[PDB]
Amino acid sequence: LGKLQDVVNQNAQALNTLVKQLSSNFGAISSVLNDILSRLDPPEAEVQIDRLITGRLQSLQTYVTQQLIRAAEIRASANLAATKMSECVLGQSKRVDFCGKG
Amino acid sequence: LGKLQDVVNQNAQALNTLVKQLSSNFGAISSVLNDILSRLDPPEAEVQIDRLITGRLQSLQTYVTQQLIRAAEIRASANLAATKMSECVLGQSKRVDFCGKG
Amino acid sequence: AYTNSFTRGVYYPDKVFRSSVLHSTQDLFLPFFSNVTWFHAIHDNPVLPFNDGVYFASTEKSNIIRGWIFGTTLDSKTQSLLIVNNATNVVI
Amino acid sequence: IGINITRFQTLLALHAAYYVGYLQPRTFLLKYNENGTITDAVDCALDPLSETKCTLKSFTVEKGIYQTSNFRVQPTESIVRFPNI
Amino acid sequence: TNLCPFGEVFNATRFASVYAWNRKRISNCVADYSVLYNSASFSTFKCYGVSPTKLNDLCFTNVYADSFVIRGDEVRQIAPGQTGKIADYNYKLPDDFTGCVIAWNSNNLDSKGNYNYLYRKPFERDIYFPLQSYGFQPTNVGYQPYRVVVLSFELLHAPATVCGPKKSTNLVKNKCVNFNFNGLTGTGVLTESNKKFLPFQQFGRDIADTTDAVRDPQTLEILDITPCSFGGVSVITPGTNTSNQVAVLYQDVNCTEV
Amino acid sequence: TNLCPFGEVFNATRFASVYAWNRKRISNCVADYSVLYNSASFSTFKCYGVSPTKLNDLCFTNVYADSFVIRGDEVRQIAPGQTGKIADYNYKLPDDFTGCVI
Numbered sequence: 119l120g121k122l123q124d125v126v127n128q129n130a131q132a133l134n135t136l137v138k139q140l141s142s143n144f145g146a147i148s149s150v151l152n153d154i155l156s157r158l159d160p161p162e163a164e165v166q167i168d169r170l171i172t173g174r175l176q177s178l179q180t181y182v183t184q185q186l187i188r189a190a191e192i193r194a195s196a197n198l199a200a201t202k203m204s205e206c207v208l209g210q211s212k213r214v215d216f217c218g219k220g
Numbered sequence: 221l222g223k224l225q226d227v228v229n230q231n232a233q234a235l236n237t238l239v240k241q242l243s244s245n246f247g248a249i250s251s252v253l254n255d256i257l258s259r260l261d262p263p264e265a266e267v268q269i270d271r272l273i274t275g276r277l278q279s280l281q282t283y284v285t286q287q288l289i290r291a292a293e294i295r296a297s298a299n300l301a302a303t304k305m306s307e308c309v310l311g312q313s314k315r316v317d318f319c320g321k322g
Numbered sequence: 323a324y325t326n327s328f329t330r331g332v333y334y335p336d337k338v339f340r341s342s343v344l345h346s347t348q349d350l351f352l353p354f355f356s357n358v359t360w361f362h363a364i365h366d367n368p369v370l371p372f373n374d375g376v377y378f379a380s381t382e383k384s385n386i387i388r389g390w391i392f393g394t395t396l397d398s399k400t401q402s403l404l405i406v407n408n409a410t411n412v413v414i
Numbered sequence: 415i416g417i418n419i420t421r422f423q424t425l426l427a428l429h430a431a432y433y434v435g436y437l438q439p440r441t442f443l444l445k446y447n448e449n450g451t452i453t454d455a456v457d458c459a460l461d462p463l464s465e466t467k468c469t470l471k472s473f474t475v476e477k478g479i480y481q482t483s484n485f486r487v488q489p490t491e492s493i494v495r496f497p498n499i
Numbered sequence: 500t501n502l503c504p505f506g507e508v509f510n511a512t513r514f515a516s517v518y519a520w521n522r523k524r525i526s527n528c529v530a531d532y533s534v535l536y537n538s539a540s541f542s543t544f545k546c547y548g549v550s551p552t553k554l555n556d557l558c559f560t561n562v563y564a565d566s567f568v569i570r571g572d573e574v575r576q577i578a579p580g581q582t583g584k585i586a587d588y589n590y591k592l593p594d595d596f597t598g599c600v601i602a603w604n605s606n607n608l609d610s611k612g613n614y615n616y617l618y619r620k621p622f623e624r625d626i627y628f629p630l631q632s633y634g635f636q637p638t639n640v641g642y643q644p645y646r647v648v649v650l651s652f653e654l655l656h657a658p659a660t661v662c663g664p665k666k667s668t669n670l671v672k673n674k675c676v677n678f679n680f681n682g683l684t685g686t687g688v689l690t691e692s693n694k695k696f697l698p699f700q701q702f703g704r705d706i707a708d709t710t711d712a713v714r715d716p717q718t719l720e721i722l723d724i725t726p727c728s729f730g731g732v733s734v735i736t737p738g739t740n741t742s743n744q745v746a747v748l749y750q751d752v753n754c755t756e757v
Numbered sequence: 758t759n760l761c762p763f764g765e766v767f768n769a770t771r772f773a774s775v776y777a778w779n780r781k782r783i784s785n786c787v788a789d790y791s792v793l794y795n796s797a798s799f800s801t802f803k804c805y806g807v808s809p810t811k812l813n814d815l816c817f818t819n820v821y822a823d824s825f826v827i828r829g830d831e832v833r834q835i836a837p838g839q840t841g842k843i844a845d846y847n848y849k850l851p852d853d854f855t856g857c858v859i
């Protein structure tokens with residue numbers, strides 16, 4: 119099941135990465151947002167929070183972009199599965215080595 | 221026409237979002253670039269303009285990335301279409317549920 | 323007494339022309355289908371609260387509704403807005 | 415004119431009805447026509463359909479399912495816990 | 500063509516005690532910000548939303564002159580992101596203030612002592628007691644009295660009423676031109692138009708938040724602002740390993756511009 | 758092995774009128790900037806693209822010493838990005854100026 123387990127592992131790894139990026143300063147004095155807001159008034163805190171926004175947002179764009187490209191790969195796999203479903207479940211396929219060796 | 225009309229809608233929505241993003245101030249004092257330039261001398265203006273550049277460029281990179289992933293979808297659909305042209309127009313498709321049910 | 327406002331009290335939020343467009347804004351608006359405190363002049367006109375500001379529909383055939391007063395305490399220990407609309411003019 | 419307002423009162427001549435309502439901070443969608451005139455509006459907070467109209471920036475909403483918001487259970491009260499030295 | 504009252508504001512007999520600072524609205528006039536900025540009088544002329552140099556090119560719906568005396572050590576407080584009890588109870592510039600702060604020594608004017616100089620959210624005023632005063636004497640250097648004016652500038656969509664000494668040209672139409680309307684700087688093809696502004700409206704806009712139309716501030720006709728003619732330049736070439744001759748496609752523009 | 762002519766700069770008998778400030782080129786010599794930086798003679802030593810510590814490790818195709826007198830209130834003006842009548846008419850620094858003000 120290495121294929122499916124890798125799709126699951128990739129999604130879980132990407133989510134664990136996305137979550138772990140909340141531990142990252144990106145140059146702000148903490149990565150836990152309530153630290154900045156409990157320590158700092160808005161004129162200062164806007165500077166620090168812009169870095170957390172920027173870093174978290176850049177991480178989120180990164181995650182979503184990996185997911186869009188992965189979604190295209192899954193969609194190609196879905197279209198391939200749909201085609202084996204059509205040609206080989208709902209049919210028999212003459213395409214050599216399309217529906218298993220033989 | 222939901223497929224083609226949604227492709228038109230998607231592209232127009234991507235453009236309209238990219239266009240709206242010109243009005244988003246990205247933490248600069250204003251989003252009208254000529255207003256910044258007619259308010260401020262370069263020692264000040266360059267920070268404000270650089271925030272707008274960083275925002276607009278990031279928005280543009282976003283739009284182009286969305287368009288590259290969408291162009292890959294459209295190209296996969298174009299290769300699919302070209303194959304239905306080659307197999308079903310110029311030929312007959314033996315491949316179950318490739319060119320219509322039945 | 324009471325009635326329903328329906329879709330009323332909408333105004334131009336800014337002095338910018340826009341056309342054939344579904345623009346969106348946030349402002350102090352009379353909420354849609356909110357409750358309307360329909361006063362009468364029968365045989366009185368109390369001081370109201372202003373809250374976040376007011377809407378004031380006032381159907382007429384007499385032209386006797388001719389002014390408004392606004393402010394904090396309306397009692398000379400404050401400056402207080404007065405409006406009059408006497409025959410032709412608006413006077414403030 | 416800068417003045418602070420908490421109260422108001424109409425003037426009538428001693429010789430009628432007036433239909434006071436109250437404003438609120440509300441998000442809205444506005445239909446400007448071809449003559450740059452507002453012909454229609456949506457109060458976004460009114461109901462889940464009106465939140466949908468604002469989420470799509472559209473006066474028609476089509477047959478479907480639209481995430482208008484994230485619901486969050488609100489903090490009931492504030493709790494303070496310091497060492498009792 | 501009216502001159503603005505800055506000659507009053509910067510010379511007014513008593514600047515107020517900072518607990519209850521003066522505010523003069525300025526409107527319906529022309530302002531020489533250059534003469535103010537070039538004036539030998541001012542110990543500081545710090546500006547925030549605009550450079551004091553740029554001011555004459557740009558104009559405003561209104562300007563508010565907040566006038567008061569401070570101890571000369573206090574000048575720190577009269578900025579976005581600055582703090583103190585005076586700058587809490589009885590003063591505050593917002594942390595995104597659009598304007599200028601102009602201040603100078605007034606020991607020659609406001610010292611006597613002068614115990615009238617009582618001190619205590621953005622532009623808030625307030626009237627146990629949180630109250631204090633100075634007592635300014637001619638013997639007081641940052642412990643002396645200083646006058647300050649804050650000019651806070653208004654950029655609403657209404658027609659401008661306070662402007663720099665900029666001089667209007669005639670209008671030009673159907674031609675790609677640089678323009679400035681009341682401080683709206685840009686470039687485009689000004690043309691008179693059928694977009695019917697309602698009588699209160701002063702700009703017109705489209706999706707981008709671009710000024711797609713204006714109403715001229717002297718003759719109240721409505722102008723479209725269509726873009727100056729633009730498009731990619733593409734060079735059609737055979738191989739250099741065949742010829743050095745080329746042809747140029749100017750994308751979408753009309754040969755009439757080229 | 759020539760020691761640089763900083764005595765002819767910092768110990769010049771008179772410095773120039775700032776409308777017409779003097780410029781001295783320095784070339785072909787050994788410069789211990791620590792002899793300057795460790796001198797208590799200087800009320801400020803601020804640097805704008807280099808740290809006065811680092812100077813001994815780094816070296817230059819030329820150095821220009823610009824030398825003049827000012828009123829003590831003016832010292833603010835003599836930096837990149839500044840404003841004031843001298844900074845307008847007769848001592849504008851580059852807004853990316855690499856060097857030190859003493």
Ligand SMILES: *[C@@H]1O[C@H](CO)[C@@H](O[C@@H]2O[C@H](CO)[C@@H](O)[C@H](O)[C@H]2NC(C)=O)[C@H](O)[C@H]1NC(C)=O
Pocket residue numbers: 394395418419420
């Ligand atoms: C307008 O002026 C009134 C006073 O006439 C202010 O009323 C006070 O409001 C605070 C809360 O904001 C209360 O704690 C006080 O008890 C009120 N005092 C009185 C005498 O009513 C009011 O704050 C002002 N409003 C604004 C927006 O400035």
Ligand SMILES: *[C@@H]1O[C@H](CO)[C@@H](O)[C@H](O)[C@H]1NC(C)=O
Pocket residue numbers: 324325326357358
């Ligand atoms: C709201 O107004 C309606 C009539 O428009 C009335 O029946 C209802 O009791 C009112 N409720 C409140 C809370 O004012």
Ligand SMILES: *[C@@H]1O[C@H](CO)[C@@H](O)[C@H](O)[C@H]1NC(C)=O
Pocket residue numbers: 406408409410411413
């Ligand atoms: C209205 O009232 C003002 C004074 O409040 C007065 O000058 C004016 O003549 C009055 N009449 C009309 C018709 O405006």
Ligand SMILES: *[C@@H]1O[C@H](CO)[C@@H](O)[C@H](O)[C@H]1NC(C)=O
Pocket residue numbers: 447448449695
């Ligand atoms: C626009 O306004 C004109 C009068 O200015 C009117 O005749 C026309 O019917 C209006 N059109 C729309 C769509 O409101």
Ligand SMILES: *[C@@H]1O[C@H](CO)[C@@H](O)[C@H](O)[C@H]1NC(C)=O
Pocket residue numbers: 505506507509510535538
């Ligand atoms: C103050 O008044 C004098 C004349 O008494 C005038 O020359 C000066 O220009 C005024 N100040 C300003 C800033 O205009």
Ligand SMILES: *[C@@H]1O[C@H](CO)[C@@H](O)[C@H](O)[C@H]1NC(C)=O
Pocket residue numbers: 716717718
């Ligand atoms: C401006 O002046 C011209 C004459 O020079 C006049 O025709 C026009 O009505 C004036 N416009 C305004 C807005 O006062």
Ligand SMILES: *[C@@H]1O[C@H](CO)[C@@H](O)[C@H](O)[C@H]1NC(C)=O
Pocket residue numbers: 738740741
């Ligand atoms: C390029 O030019 C050389 C001579 O300059 C010629 O021999 C060759 O065939 C040419 N090749 C192509 C691809 O045009």
Ligand SMILES: *[C@@H]1O[C@H](CO)[C@@H](O)[C@H](O)[C@H]1NC(C)=O
Pocket residue numbers: 753754755
């Ligand atoms: C080019 O400009 C002329 C007017 O100068 C116009 O008649 C013609 O229709 C234009 N052509 C295009 C392709 O826009």
Ligand SMILES: *[C@@H]1O[C@H](CO)[C@@H](O)[C@H](O)[C@H]1NC(C)=O
Pocket residue numbers: 763764767768
């Ligand atoms: C300047 O002269 C003094 C003694 O007059 C000396 O201490 C100092 O080192 C000299 N500086 C330079 C750069 O030669």
